[PDB]
């Protein structure tokens, strides 16, 4: 009559999963939040308009700005760069560099 308790289990397999597995899950979701859900494309994939359009992922996993040729560890770093004064300049330089030709 242990039904009095009120806990139970499903009959499938072996539950909890392994602490390492939780981190993989948690570091994907955190990079989904901060990314605001955008799919940042790989560098080799042969271009869904991007929110910006410069950020990518190299053949490795890292994120890169293709203007500035900087390498970034995480989305948090990227938003630092996109809000930086160097990534400002390289847009202006490409601004002029286009405004001198068509």
């Amino acid at each position: 009559m242990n039904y009095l308790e009120g806990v139970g289990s499903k009959k499938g397999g072996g539950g909890i999963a392994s602490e390492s597995q939780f981190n993989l899950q948690r570091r994907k979701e955190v990079e989904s939040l901060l990314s605001k859900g955008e799919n940042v494309p790989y560098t080799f994939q042969d271009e869904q308009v991007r929110s910006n359009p410069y950020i990518y992922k190299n053949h490795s996993g890292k994120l890169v700005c293709k203007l500035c040729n900087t390498m970034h560890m995480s989305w948090s770093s990227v938003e630092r760069h996109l809000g930086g004064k160097k990534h400002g300049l390289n847009v202006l330089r490409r601004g002029i560099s286009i405004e001198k030709s068509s």
């Binding site: 955190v30 939040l33 948090s76």
Partner: protein
Amino acid sequence: KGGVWTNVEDQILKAAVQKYGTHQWSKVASLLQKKTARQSE
């Protein structure tokens, strides 16, 4: 006794609270290591 909040773990709250709302605090600490619900709220 620090429980100190870096600007990353501040930036993940405002994205978590935006997602989950303010009464699901147990879920906000799932996105955020080092921190419990009573700390997040």
